[model samples]
Target: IPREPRRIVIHRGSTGLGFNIVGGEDGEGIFISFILAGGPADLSGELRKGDQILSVNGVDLRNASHEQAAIALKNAGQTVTIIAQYKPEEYSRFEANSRV
Candidate 1:
């Protein structure tokens, strides 16, 4: 099933993007690990926990490393544009397929 990608625009506050990202290594794509409550991304109401970030400011992150992804996001500056999608069952699917 294909889900529509969301374009979340968030203004970086004093606390920065106010979100943490994980994955992007060991055959994993960048995923939103957590969102700081009442923060920029949290206030956007679009970025969701466990969402996979596809791009940042049009910079592809699908195959980026964890550190690479972190740096790219850090350079996004004040206004950030993020492209993301949510696939709640992806991990389970992966696990099932790997259990050969």
Candidate 2:
């Protein structure tokens, strides 16, 4: 059976893919465990392990449980769009650079 990805901690020393479930009050949103080397996700240049996933196909995940969000991502493929909010870098911008 296909299973959705859940919040899992990346093992510090594991050679192969390894992720442990995040359990506790702070472990709220879905987190990416691993990105296969040179895989589609890695090539996308938008996502990375430890990044909190906010949505799939434009669905907001503010009130969703880990399981619910995982199900959505499990079916993500061609034409699927994922939107997420993450920690902003020093140079991140909030407003549009161009005016129309």
Candidate 3:
């Protein structure tokens, strides 16, 4: 079954978004690779590793390549709104659990 997509708003710090993303390059969907400790994503409480990033700051990432997504995330401004969906597959599940 498909899960509901979540709309998350994050305020970046002086450093950046505070999360790493992967996928969208080799025939895979874009997903969060990890979150920095105490960073914006971690503090947001909704952004998690393995969560598919559907879009960011109104930029559609569904068909974006890895670099494209990275640039969009980096230039998403101070306060960014993201639409992410939870992936329940085993691979995603494992990645999500890796943090805790």
Candidate 4:
């Protein structure tokens, strides 16, 4: 689901895309792992720790590689429209390795 764009400066890149390190073309999507405390990302009150960054402005990053996802955030700009999804729970701590 697309969400309202959040404004943030990202000279420093993101943490993880909520995917496994050794997997290729996994269903696990690229998500914002966390917001650096007091950094540009955190300055935007709308950005949260568990929010999953879906796209920048209108760029669809759904299939971007790990590195591609990081640079999409302009190193520091006013035109950044960070479209992200929110997870009610912290993304970094959740996992599903079993079939239920």
TM-score of each: 0.85, 0.53, 0.85, 0.57
The C-alpha stretches of model 1 lying farther than 4 A from their native spots are: 91-100
- Residue-wise lDDT of candidate 2 within 1-100, one digit each (tens)? 1133333222222232222212112335665556676545555555554455656666766567766765665555444455544432311221122122
Model 1: how far residue 54 lies from native, Å: 0.3
Mark the regions of model 4 whose C-alpha exceeds 4 Å error after superposition: 1-25, 74-78, 89-100
Poorest stretch of ten by lDDT in candidate 4: 16-25
RMSD of each: 3.5, 12.5, 4.1, 6.3
Q: Which candidate is the best by lDDT?
A: 3
TM-score winner between 1 and 4, please give it.
1
Q: Residue-wise lDDT of candidate 4 within 1-100, one digit each (tens)? A: 2244454333333542222221113545466545556655655456665566667767777676656666665432444666667653435444343222
Q: Give Cα-based local distance difference scores for all models.
A: 0.83, 0.46, 0.84, 0.51
The reply for model 3, stretches above 4 Å from the true place, is 90-100
**Residue 60 local lDDT, model 2:** 66
Candidate 2 stretches greater than 4 Å from native: 1-27, 88-100
1-100 per-residue lDDT for model 3 (tens digits): 3368889999989898889887886567788878899898898888877689999988999899999998899888999999998785834555666668
After aligning candidate 2 to the native by TM-score, how far in Å is the CA of 73 from where it should be?
0.7
**CA lDDT, candidate 3, residue 12:** 87
